[model samples]
Target chain A: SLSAYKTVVVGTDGSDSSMRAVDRAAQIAGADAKLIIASAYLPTAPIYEILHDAKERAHNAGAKNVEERPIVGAPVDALVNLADEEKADLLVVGNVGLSTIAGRLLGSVPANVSRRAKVDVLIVHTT
Target chain B: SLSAYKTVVVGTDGSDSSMRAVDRAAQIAGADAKLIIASAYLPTAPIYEILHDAKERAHNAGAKNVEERPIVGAPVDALVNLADEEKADLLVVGNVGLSTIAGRLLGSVPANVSRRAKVDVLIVHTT
Candidate 1:
């Protein structure tokens, strides 16, 4: 009857699956929790719009204090670093498998983030 | 304001970190949820006692309906298989790193289980 996260960070790419992860993160976060919506992109790729949309979605899903962070780097490392920097108690991500160019380009972000996270991680089944 | 899991599965090895996983799983599960404490060991290894102890701990942590399963196989596969078999809503495990002999034996169970699981996976920060 008592499960809550004080500061939760969820990574998104503005994709449907990633939005689902945001929703789940909002639900799991405490009533007064700080929900950080993180969007990581390649260099020079604009991500503010994506982060804004995810922040709106999280707010609609019951988050009160939502923070938007647009990171410029790889998704996995960027999310992990942001979580650590923010001292998040929980990090959420979608169960997206490895994206491919010719082959698996950067490995699965969820797998890598969950493996490297120092805090608790919730890998939502969004795939 | 509302976060709940119906049938939650948590893997344990009777270690401190694993017991912490059980506590977190119990907290996340709904009040009327079914919490399954699973322990996987080598063939012929005794694990009923471990499962029982975890079951008690989970019940103490607020889980109502708790089930115990002792499996014969690797931890990652066994946990994923059990979660699938039970149609679990969430799979839980500790963030214990890869156990090593000389090199890593079976890759980190948390990483493997989180990657392979079809359901949601919560890797508790117990390590």
Candidate 2:
């Protein structure tokens, strides 16, 4: 009866806020559902490091069928583009992060992504 | 020097979801802000009939400044237009209505309104 979601996408940036979002996404996605955990790093940062951190968090949260991808641009743009590419049924994100001062002044990633994404978005508030 | 929301709009359809939304909206609106409790009824339904029922419900919800307006069209379209006309900062509506089965088959009103509305929308879920 399709009682569970098919595909769920979560955007992360290796920040504490993004980790909270990843945890919430893992909690809601069904056990067997495909979970896509996406993270973006600046060209300067080590891409492998960010991916490793995201995977560890997802695994810790008990997410099944996880796939990790890295984007090469700004976090919000990368996340939104990935959501479209994956045709994700849901997009989970953090409401604000340590960079919120910059984000609020220049439009945060979650706000921009929420305005554009064609799927349901869950914005988790970090503790 | 506004300390709180200037205008709050809640859509009521005599359903548990709508009532919950109304309560939430009332709680958030400032004491001086104008509170509008609106309901949309089908063109075939009696105009005075729905307005009277909605006003009673709004009064029961403790909305300080209540105005009941009934429109003749689909619930989503009517609520969206009203939000624009009222210059509402927030629009609250039920996640689902009494016609859950019909709404599911034809697309839920909240989902449609969320896509089209320019203002912020809150879809309150009733358990």
lDDT of 1 by residue, A61-102 (tens): 888889898777565555556656776666666655444573
Off by over 4 Å in 2: A74-77, A97-127, B1-127
Q: Give the clashing pairs for model 2.
A: none
TM-score chain B for all models.
Answer: 0.70, 0.62
lDDT scores in order: 0.65, 0.55
| Docking level for model 2 | incorrect
Q: What is the lDDT of candidate 2?
A: 0.55
Best by TM-score: 1
Stretches of candidate 1 above 4 Å error? A1-3, A98-127, B1-3, B43-45, B98-127
Clashes of 1: 0
**How many steric overlaps are in each model, in order?**
0, 0
Candidate 2, B34-127: lDDT as tens digits: 7777777654456565556665655665556777777657765565566567766555555542346674556532243323221122211111
DockQ of each: 0.25, 0.05
TM-scores for every candidate against the unseen true structure: 0.75, 0.43
